[PDB]
Each structure stands twice: as C-alpha cells, then as structure tokens.
Design a protein around this ligand. Sequence first.
Ligand code: SF4
Ligand code: SF4
Ligand code: FES
Lengths: 230, 56
Amino acid sequence: SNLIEVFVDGQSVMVEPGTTVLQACEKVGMQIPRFCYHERLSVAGNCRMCLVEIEKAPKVVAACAMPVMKGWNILTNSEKTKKAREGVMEFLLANHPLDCPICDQGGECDLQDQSMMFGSDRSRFLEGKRAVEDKNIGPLVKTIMTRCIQCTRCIRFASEIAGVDDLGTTGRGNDMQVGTYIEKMFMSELSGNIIDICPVGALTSKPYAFTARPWETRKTESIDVMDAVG
Amino acid sequence: ASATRLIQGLRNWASGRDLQAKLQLRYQEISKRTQPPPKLPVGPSHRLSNNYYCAR
Ligand code: SF4
Ligand code: SF4
Ligand code: FES
C-alpha cells in the first residue's frame, strides 16, 4: 500500500514514496538542521547544512532534496554527519559580520541557535571577511545585505508566491549580491512576509527595527481584523 | 616596629614569643602595586586541525 521502510537511527518506520529524507526524520521526531529548506517553498540545495550520513555509502547526502529508496538506514548522529555540520557551520560564520548586538534577530536568529547546538567552539579565519553594500528594498523593509548568507529563500518566496520577480542573484564567487539590480522599490502585497522568511537578520522590519528584543516580549494568541480571512 | 627598646622588652617579657620579628603590621612586603601587564596562556584547546567538537 505504497510503503517504504526507513530505519531512522535503527528504528523502523513506514514512509510513503516520493517524500524527502527530512520529512521521514520529522516523521520520527528528529530535526536535521537546515537553512534553505522551508515547508512552504520549493526545495533548493543551496545551504548544505542539511547533510546526513546513510549507512554503507561513501558520500554524505543532502536530506532536503533526496528521495527515499527501498530500505534505508540513516545515521543522524554519526561521526561524519557531525563533522560535516561543524564544517558547514565554520564556513557560514566567516563572511558574516560581528553585528549580534546591533542586529534585530538577536534573540531569534538561526545561525546563533545552530552554532550553539551543532557547531564548533573556537573559530579560525584570521583575515578576510568581505562586506557588501546594502540596498533599499522598500520603506517598509530595512535591508542590511551584509548579514545575508545567500540562502536564496527570499527569491523563491517572491517568485513563487508574490509573483513579482524582482529579487535576483547577481555575480559570482564571493560576490553574489541578492537584490534588485535597478534600484527599484519592491512594493507589492505580502511584502511584509519576507522578514519572517529570511532566517538571518538581513531583511528586517523597518518600523519595529530597533525597539525591542525577543526574549522580553511575551507572546499572545489573537485573531486578525480588517480581512475576511482572519 | 619603629618603637623604643623598653616597651619592646616589656612586650617580649609579658609574652615570651620574641614578638618583634612577627607582629602583624605589614610594612615592606606589601606586594608592589601596578605590576607589569600579564600575558595569559591558553591551555589544551585552540590547536589547529584537531579541535573537532565531536571529540570533546
Ligand atoms: S543575523 Fe544572526 S549571526 Fe548575523 S548578526 Fe544577526 S544575530 Fe548575529
Ligand atoms: S536575504 Fe535572507 S532570505 Fe534572501 S538569500 Fe539572504 S539570508 Fe536568504
Ligand atoms: S536544506 Fe538541504 S541544502 Fe539547505
């Protein structure tokens, strides 16, 4: 009845065909750490944090965009899984500036939480650290593109949901700006949703900008007005 | 210290410890303040190409 056996960490589970490895690991409750996978957008393999080891295999595969063959056995806490995660984390924190005090996602970043719970302790990379000139996406969205990790999730969101097609990658190598080439104010509907999509503090809110910090403000359930959907 | 001989002798006689040499007033062996600035060593970390956090 369309069932495939996957042994997540030895424990067996039946999984429908076609789904990714990460949906199976979330079917058993695990979380493989991730930056450019998102459960509402198309799957791209840019961030490379999502790597996981399959038993009896030389290479380390990407759990975001790997279909399920018959009878897997997946090690989420093996040796080279942890070595690959600490490696990718040590690459990501190189060209990322020292802005964690002045940043706006300082309580709710993902580089910080994953560099705690998966990454290394001592750093390296004595010299370098590129800096990119920031843009002006809109008067509603403050934009510091120095903090960008080029995960390409704002672009997939704009193109597949907002339908605007204004955000683009430009350049090669380290020089990959993510933005509008023509100084154009990205002004459309659902433009506010892009600040929750960007996982690092690059595309942040303009009126909220420097007024709070998320470990103090308490959360409360509520229902919208002014829209019939609520 | 810096007291005369008679009261020193009566201190030594009223308590036979030869009290002059150790008397708990610190005069010269206070540690000289504004020491030279220190360089602090780093222990068994920071060695490049072994510090995988999966080990420790
Ligand atoms: S986006 Fe994250 S890592 Fe970058 S400055 Fe902000 S809190 Fe720090
Ligand atoms: S601006 Fe944000 S969402 Fe867009 S690529 Fe950079 S980190 Fe990802
Ligand atoms: S989630 Fe698989 S590469 Fe980013």
